[PDB]
Design a protein around this ligand. Structure first.
Ligand SMILES: CCCCCCCCCCCCCCCCCC(=O)OC[C@H](COP(=O)([O-])OCC(O)COP(=O)([O-])OC[C@@H](COC(=O)CCCCCCCCCCCCCCCCC)OC(=O)CCCCCCCCCCCCCCCCC)OC(=O)CCCCCCCCCCCCCCCCC
Ligand SMILES: CCCCCCCCCCCCCCCCCC(=O)OC[C@H](COP(=O)([O-])OCC(O)COP(=O)([O-])OC[C@@H](COC(=O)CCCCCCCCCCCCCCCCC)OC(=O)CCCCCCCCCCCCCCCCC)OC(=O)CCCCCCCCCCCCCCCCC
Ligand SMILES: CCCCCCCCCCCCCCCCCC(=O)OC[C@H](COP(=O)([O-])OCC[N+](C)(C)C)OC(=O)CCCCCCCCCCCCCCCCC
Ligand SMILES: CCCCCCCCCCCC(=O)SCCNC(=O)CCNC(=O)[C@H](O)C(C)(C)COP(=O)(O)O
Ligand code: SF4
Ligand code: SF4
Ligand code: SF4
Lengths: 109, 218, 191, 172, 189, 44, 161, 198, 57, 56
């Protein structure tokens, strides 16, 4: 957006209320529509500056729910993003941590 | 608000047999015969093929000499569709499906003690899109904030439900009654007497529906 | 006539119903609920649908799951069946109205644990009373013989006419002496 | 002329002829034309009150030429004579004669032509359209009038007449 | 709902009778869904700005909608058998009302009337004009190379059929297909 | 993407041969077969 | 006395005119769709012997189903007057009853009863299909009873005079 | 606004004697642009739009008018800025706006024309865009705009034998007359209006 | 419902058609307006003579 | 009429005053439910779904 700085106010991780509702909803819809690791990684990397822990956990849930196979694109693009976000998590990110870990375990990566 | 996209094309799902989510029966050779008919200029426009074939002659002869409409359609509809059970609902002895959200006839409820739930806040009057509710209130001798005149013009009111939605104490409720046919236009000028009588008569079913509606959020 | 057709009387259901309920009841079931000929007493042939319950006006309600269409499971059997086009949908009481409409699967039960509240101020259900002397008459309407009271009250809410003296009255010079009609007490004058 | 008022929009006098074997003619001024009006182009802009006044006079002329046909078809001849209707519409125009805006006058003339066409084609009802033809202060010719008010208030000012008549219901 | 009513009325005007009953049965089912979600079988007044009656939305409603979608193919085929291939229907509609893109453009024709010219104009699948989840659903819009009543009727039938696919995708977007699998038995828990 | 084959969104993909055979036609229409049959039969 | 023959023939006439009750094919607004819904299979009108006729000359009931505009009121009056007697009028919907959602409008008539005599009113906006069915059946019952509502008095011999 | 957008500056490049006043907002679609167009150039501008190469594939989606004379900012009066489009509403008798869609540029273009003359004169474009006929008829009847050189000026959506402009803010929703049935005349008549006040 | 299970619907409609009143338009020709349906009814009720129900029946 | 947060004696007194006889007014039951939050009454629909018949 014009004259917009996406640096988190917490200085740890971005939050949904910082972004415009339209951006959050549209990125969530794109994540839901993604049906392969390649396209999901493309979407996540393109919109990384707007990405949120909630949406990342939701992407993991979508992959698990639709049994999208985990492949080289996942391990090479998505995994670094997951590592960065999980490292930046804190106490208030318990929901995202539990969801991401549970769905990664279920997918059996 | 918007998002940025790098790959406009949504690539087709993997067609490999080994990959998961592979459907071996998605394509049927007998049915998916599109390619044969795809290259036909008649489908794409008003033009005609360079070389007409006797297949068109046979098709035209079948369509014209032996008109297949009066047999094909007659059979398929008259003889076959008549074998399905009738869809009719015997209204006098049976009723169609309704829901607890159904908005029928307006009524005014009371607390279990018998006191009126209506306090003259006029929220329902203001929210009524059709200006069908008229309320005048005066303090009761005991001191309660109760209305002295509460009229709903059933002919002017659109059964939207805004009145019950805006009611903060569930006083005015659009109960399920819908067989409220009136022979005189004056009979549709519902008054406080009529609304309270409707509430007293229909409290059981209205309360039963309100129970489920209140419990849904929980 | 022929409330029960020959093919329906040739079934066990008709004979059991005749044995238990009686000829009059079994024959008038069709008149009470004129529906498809094969639905007289229920769709199944080996027996007749059990009565779900009865309401305060003598109507009998039944539910059969073998009907050929989903929207015919629940049906009524009206006490008053004088002629066709006589009983209407307004005869269903409040408790059974929702059950027929399929709003909920609970039905009124007399003398038992009920799913419907029974308050002290409730009134008995009444059919549509339009076209009857016991119809809704707006206050002040020409039909209402006491329209004068309502009209006078509405007029007085904004402007109450002054009640002028009538008949012979006491005169003090050019003045008519009348006691004040104010209900309020003049406490300062009294004490 | 491809217009509703064109000379070729006349109703033929015969199935195989127009009014004669040696001539072609028809009536389209005092009666409605043969083909319906599909489009009524806006009056060409008038730059002068002279042009505006000419438009008003021509519209009134057309209305006067058409009034007898309108009365006959709508069965309102008894209520007023043709000349009475003409004079009543003249009073209607006189009330508006103070206009001094050519554009407003053109718009008014367009509306008048439209309503005249509606009257010709029975689009309007006689009771709804006779409000323009009705007398301003004279009784309708098909009814018996009441002069009780005039007898009671003979040689009294309009103010006093209105004062006695009242202007509000007295019940409330 | 709208396409059913339009096609039924069109068939009734042309002369076919029973199509109105067949279409109006499905209309009654959809009106039942309306009443179930908002209490009014017509004039729902359901959507409101920045608010939703989440309580009304129920899973069983979605399941009933899925059942309606499955059974709607039967009604579509019943109408299609008596209308689409009928010689009288083809002679009544084909080459009637034919118009070009320029007419479509000059008179501001839009939706089915526009697509029957091949303009390929759909506001749901527009980058800058999409307004709901449509832009992120993989459905198809149909256009005809002949701008006549027959092409418009075919487009309406295909759009009715494709609304089923869109509804199926939308309902799947809110479905939990997978489930916990036991490590020992490799079966759902 | 549901509009293309082998999409992850599809669910009914395993052992659908019998179901598809029951649900959908197993025959193809020859263009002039009905015409020839009916015309020759009518003449004879 | 004629009553001996008139009364049974009155009953037969009322039964026949109740059984055959053909409304007019006339719909103005959304209430039209509800009328069509009653006509179609889910609530078959034909069960009660009501079949719609296009021409007013062949109609017994005038279903005023939809809003009435000032631009249309003369047309409604003409249709009512041209419908062959005997006839009844049924207003359907809030708009037809008392102006409905457009009671405060400059174009809508505040009620079809101002232009026509309305025999029965069916409240709703739109009235449910069952609501319209109930109104029609109530109108049919009232129509059947209208022939003899106990007007004439019985003499000492129980014969009306 | 993450799309490729370009201003419709072709109009003002060609009509070199006009000044440009254009807006885009997130309240509109990403491809929607508003502009101010003078009435005396409106007809020529539409002529250019209807046959220019990239504007050839243009359809007049909508047309209407606003009675700007009675327009007032009811809240946040001080927040108004001189660049806002609302500044042109004040003290102007009428504002007629047209809206077109262009397929080649995948764009929406709205043009606002301010009518300050009391008679509300403006050149019609129904001779250029066919669907503008009924749109302009409705606008003229409901707001009293005197369209000039219009194909058909007859009313559309207004009652017979009546002259009025209901959509003007001066007019009252209840109207000025009601239609009843007169027994003496045995037909529908129209008389003065008495209504109900909530 | 017109007769038990709709057994007398045709009787009811015939009686109702008899009962319904008739008015001839003022502009229409009174004589022909009634003469034409009378001739049509006579012809229609003469139709049945040209019918066979057996070798010479 | 009254919430469970009120005393069981008060609840019983109010119910008796309003003449309620179809509600559980047991003092011990009211005490057990006192200041207790629990979901609404539930029942069970038991498969298979079948029509009740009177075969004899
Ligand atoms: C001893 C011999 C006696 C012979 C007597 C003959 C005369 C009387 C026969 C009457 C039979 C029908 C019942 C009529 C009374 C109904 C009363 C009533 O419901 O009141 C409510 C009634 C209105 O309520 P509703 O529910 O609308 O009425 C239902 C209808 O009637 C519609 O329902 P429905 O039930 O009335 O219609 C039934 C009819 C349907 O018919 C039709 O639809 C055809 C209609 C054609 C037009 C006819 C027009 C007639 C106009 C009459 C006008 C009035 C005349 C009055 C004369 C008075 C003279 C004093 O067909 C039948 O079902 C025939 C029944 C008889 C069949 C034979 C029974 C035995 C069979 C099995 C034998 C073997 C058993 C072995 C057992 C072994 C056990 C071990 O109000 C009235 O009082 C009006 C009554 C009108 C009656 C119309 C009858 C029409 C048919 C007449 C001819 C039927 C065939 C007779 C053959 C006789 C051969 C000898
Ligand atoms: C007394 C009591 C009476 C009670 C009566 C009760 C009511 C009965 C109603 C009966 C109605 C008729 C049946 C309708 C079935 C509809 C089936 C369906 O949906 O498919 C339609 C089907 C075509 O649609 P489709 O197959 O779905 O098309 C897709 C295909 O993929 C497309 O493939 P394609 O286009 O390539 O070819 C497909 C073609 C197949 O084409 C071929 O395969 C032809 C191949 C040969 C081509 C020509 C080359 C020459 C071949 C001959 C060579 C001979 C010489 C060889 C010399 C060799 C020398 C080395 O299919 C056809 O067969 C179409 C021809 C249509 C024939 C029309 C039949 C009219 C029947 C009228 C019955 C009226 C009954 C009146 C009442 C009773 C009497 C009073 O058409 C039929 O097959 C029609 C039925 C044919 C007759 C089968 C049944 C016969 C028995 C009837 C018994 C009736 C009951 C009472 C009997 C008496 C009891 C005492
Ligand atoms: C007794 C046990 C065995 C029963 C087997 C079933 C037999 C049913 C036979 C048909 C019904 C007969 C009349 C039932 C009683 C009616 C009493 C009454 O008041 O009638 C008023 C009723 C009034 O009519 P309604 O009650 O039918 O309908 C009017 C009400 N509405 C409008 C709602 C429908 O009169 C009639 O029943 C109609 C006239 C009937 C005329 C024909 C009579 C035939 C009799 C056949 C007897 C066969 C017996 C079986 C053994 C024979 C051996 C040879
Ligand atoms: C069939 C029913 C038709 C009903 C039609 C109702 C609608 C009518 C539409 C409005 C018609 C008008 O008011 S059109 C209003 C026209 N404007 C003017 O007239 C102002 C300028 N006036 C003049 O030039 C003169 O005064 C003049 C009086 C013309 C001659 O007078 P003489 O030189 O002295
Ligand atoms: S249903 Fe709507 S219009 Fe009718 S009284 Fe209630 S709030 Fe007003
Ligand atoms: S019914 Fe409800 S909203 Fe209306 S005045 Fe009474 S308490 Fe207020
Ligand atoms: S009453 Fe309601 S449903 Fe009927 S026409 Fe008026 S607005 Fe439409």
């Amino acid at each position: 957006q014009r004259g917009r700085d996406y640096t988190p106010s917490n200085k740890k991780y971005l939050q949904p209320w910082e972004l415009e509702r339209k951006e959050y909803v549209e990125l969530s819809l794109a994540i839901q529509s993604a049906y392969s690791c390649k396209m999901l990684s493309e979407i996540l990397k393109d919109n990384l500056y707007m990405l949120t822990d909630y949406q990342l956990s939701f992407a993991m849930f979508h992959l698990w729910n639709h049994e999208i196979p985990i492949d080289n694109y996942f391990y090479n693009v998505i995994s670094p993003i997951l590592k960065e976000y999980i490292t930046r998590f804190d106490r208030e990110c318990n929901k995202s941590l539990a969801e991401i870990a549970t769905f990664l375990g279920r997918m059996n990566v | 608000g918007y998002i940025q996209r790098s790959n406009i094309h949504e690539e087709a799902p993997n067609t490999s047999v080994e990959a998961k989510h592979h459907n071996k029966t998605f394509y049927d050779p007998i049915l998916d015969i599109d390619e044969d008919l795809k290259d036909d200029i008649r489908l794409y426009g008003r033009d005609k093929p360079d070389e007409l074939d006797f297949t068109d002659v046979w098709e035209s002869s079948y369509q014209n000499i032996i008109c297949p409409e009066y047999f094909y359609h007659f059979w398929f509809c008259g003889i076959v569709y008549s074998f399905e059970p009738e869809w009719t609902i015997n209204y006098p002895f049976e009723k169609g499906p309704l829901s607890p959200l159904f908005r029928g006839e307006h009524a005014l409820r009371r607390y279990p003690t018998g006191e009126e739930r209506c306090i003259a806040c006029k929220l329902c009057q203001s929210a009524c899109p059709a200006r069908a509710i008229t309320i005048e209130t005066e303090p009761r001798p005991d001191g309660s904030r109760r209305t002295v005149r509460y009229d709903i013009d059933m002919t002017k009111c659109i059964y939207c439900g805004f009145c019950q939605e805006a009611c903060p104490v569930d006083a005015i409720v659009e109960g399920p009654n819908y067989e409220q046919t009136a022979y005189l236009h004056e009979d549709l000028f519902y008054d406080k007497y009529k609304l309270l009588e409707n509430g007293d008569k229909w409290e059981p079913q209205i309360a039963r529906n309100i129970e489920y509606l209140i419990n849904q959020p929980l | 006539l022929w409330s029960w057709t020959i093919n329906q009387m040739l079934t066990p259901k008709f004979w059991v119903h005749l044995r238990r309920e009686g000829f009059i009841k079994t024959w008038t079931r069709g008149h009470k609920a004129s529906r498809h000929a094969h639905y007289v007493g229920g769709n199944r042939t080996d027996g007749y649908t059990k009565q779900v319950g009865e309401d305060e006006f003598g109507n009998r309600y039944y539910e059969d799951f073998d009907v050929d269409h989903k929207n015919q499971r629940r049906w009524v059997e009206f006490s008053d069946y004088f002629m066709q086009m006589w009983s209407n949908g307004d005869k269903v009481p409040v408790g059974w109205h929702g059950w027929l409409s399929h709003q909920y699967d609970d039905f009124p039960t007399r003398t038992g644990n009920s799913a419907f509240v029974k308050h002290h101020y409730l009134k008995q259900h009444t059919a549509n009373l339009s076209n009857t002397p016991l119809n809704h008459v707006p206050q002040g309407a020409p039909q209402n013989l006491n329209r004068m009271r309502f009209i006078t009250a509405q007029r007085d809410r904004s402007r109450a006419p002054w009640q002028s003296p009538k008949g012979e009255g006491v005169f003090q010079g050019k003045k008519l002496i009348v006691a004040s009609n104010s209900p309020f007490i003049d406490d300062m004058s009294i004490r | 002329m491809n217009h509703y008022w064109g000379s070729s929009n006349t109703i033929p006098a015969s199935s195989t002829q127009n009014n004669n074997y040696f001539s072609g003619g028809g009536n389209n001024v005092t009666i409605r034309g043969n083909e319906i009006m599909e489009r009524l182009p806006s009056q060409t802009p008038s730059q002068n009150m002279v042009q505006a006044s000419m438009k008003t006079l021509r519209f009134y002329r057309k209305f006067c030429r058409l009034i007898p046909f309108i009365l006959r078809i709508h069965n309102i001849g008894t209520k007023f004579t043709a000349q009475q209707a003409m004079i009543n519409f003249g009073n209607y125009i006189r009330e508006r004669n103070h206009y001094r805006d050519p554009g407003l006058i053109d718009h008014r003339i367009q509306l008048g032509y439209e309503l005249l066409y509606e009257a010709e084609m029975h689009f309007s009802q006689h009771t709804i359209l006779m409000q323009y033809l009705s007398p301003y202060n004279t009784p309708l010719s098909d009814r018996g009038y009441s002069y009780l008010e005039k007898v009671k208030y003979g040689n009294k000012s309009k103010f006093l007449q209105g004062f006695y008549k009242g202007n509000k219901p007295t019940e409330f | 709902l709208n396409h059913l009513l339009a096609v039924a009325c069109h068939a009734l005007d042309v002369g076919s009778m029973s199509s109105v009953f067949w279409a109006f049965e499905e209309r009654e089912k959809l009106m039942e869904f309306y009443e179930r979600v908002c209490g009014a079988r017509m004039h729902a007044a359901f959507y409101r700005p920045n608010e939703v009656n989440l309580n009304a939305v129920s899973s069983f409603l979605m399941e009933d909608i899925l059942e309606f979608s499955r059974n709607f193919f039967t009604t579509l085929n019943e109408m299609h058998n008596v209308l689409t291939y009928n010689k009288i229907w083809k002679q009544r509609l084909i080459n009637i009302g034919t118009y070009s893109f320029q007419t479509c453009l000059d008179y501001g024709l839009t939706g089915v009337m526009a697509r029957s010219c091949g303009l390929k104009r759909d506001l749901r699948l527009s980058k800058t004009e999409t307004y709901a989840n449509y832009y992120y659903l993989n459905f198809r819009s149909y256009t005809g190379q002949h701008g006549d009543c027959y092409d418009r009727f075919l487009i309406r039938m295909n759009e009715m059929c494709e609304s089923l696919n869109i509804v199926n995708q939308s309902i799947n977007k809110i479905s939990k297909f997978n489930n916990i699998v036991s490590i020992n038995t490799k079966k759902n828990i | 993407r549901a509009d293309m084959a082998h999409s992850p969104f599809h669910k009914a993909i395993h052992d659908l041969e019998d179901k598809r055979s029951k649900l959908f036609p197993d025959r193809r229409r020859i263009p002039g077969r009905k015409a020839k049959l009916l015309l020759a039969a009518s003449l004879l | 006395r004629v009553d001996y023959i008139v009364t049974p023939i009155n009953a037969v006439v009322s039964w026949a005119r109740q059984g055959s009750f053909w409304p007019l094919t006339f719909g103005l607004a959304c209430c039209a769709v509800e009328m069509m819904h009653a006509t179609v299979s889910r609530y078959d009108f034909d069960r009660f012997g009501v079949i719609f006729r296009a021409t007013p000359r062949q109609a017994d009931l005038i279903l005023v189903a939809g809003t009435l505009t000032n631009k249309m009121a003369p047309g409604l009056r003409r249709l009512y007057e041209q419908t062959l007697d005997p006839k009844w009028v049924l207003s359907m919907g809030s708009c037809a009853n008392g102006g409905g959602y457009y009671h405060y409008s400059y174009s809508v008539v505040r009620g079809c009863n101002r232009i026509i005599p309305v025999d029965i009113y069916v409240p709703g906006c739109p009235p449910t299909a069952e609501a319209l069915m109930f109104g029609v059946l109530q109108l049919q019952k009232s129509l059947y009873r209208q022939i003899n509502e106990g007007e004439k008095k019985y003499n000492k011999k129980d014969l009306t005079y | 606004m993450q799309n490729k957008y370009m201003q419709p500056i072709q109009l003002f490049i060609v009509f070199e004697k006009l000044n440009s006043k254009m807006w885009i907002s997130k309240k509109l679609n990403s491809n929607h642009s508003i502009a101010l167009i003078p009435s005396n150039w409106f007809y020529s501008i539409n002529l250019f739009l209807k046959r220019e190469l990239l504007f050839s594939n243009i359809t007049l989606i909508e047309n209407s008018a606003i009675d700007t004379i009675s327009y007032n900012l009811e809240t946040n009066q001080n927040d108004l800025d001189k660049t806002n489009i609302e500044n042109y509403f004040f003290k102007n008798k009428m504002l007629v706006f047209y809206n077109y869609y262009n397929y080649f540029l995948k764009s929406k273009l709205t043009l606002f024309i301010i009518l300050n003359n009391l008679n509300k004169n403006i050149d019609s474009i129904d001779r250029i865009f066919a669907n503008a006929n009924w749109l302009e008829r409705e606008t003229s009847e409901m707001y009293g705009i005197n369209y000039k050189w219009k194909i058909d000026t007859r009313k559309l959506l207004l009652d017979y034998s009546k002259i009025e402009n209901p959509m003007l803010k001066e007019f009252q929703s209840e109207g000025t007359q009601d239609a009843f049935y007169n027994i003496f005349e045995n037909q529908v008549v129209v008389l003065k209006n008495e209504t109900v006040e909530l | 419902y017109v007769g038990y299970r709709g057994r007398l619907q045709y009787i009811a409609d015939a009686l109702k058609l008899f009962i319904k009143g008739i008015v001839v338009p003022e502009g229409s020709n009174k004589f022909w307006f009634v003469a034409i349906p009378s001739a049509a009814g006579a012809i229609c009720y003469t139709f049945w003579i040209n019918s066979m129900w057996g070798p010479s029946v | 009429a009254l919430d469970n947060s009120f005393s069981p004696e008060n609840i019983a007194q109010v119910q008796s005053s309003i003449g309620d006889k179809v509600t559980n007014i047991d003092t011990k039951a009211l005490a057990l439910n006192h200041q207790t939050e629990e979901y609404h009454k539930t029942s069970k629909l038991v498969y298979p779904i079948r029509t009740n018949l009177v075969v004899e």
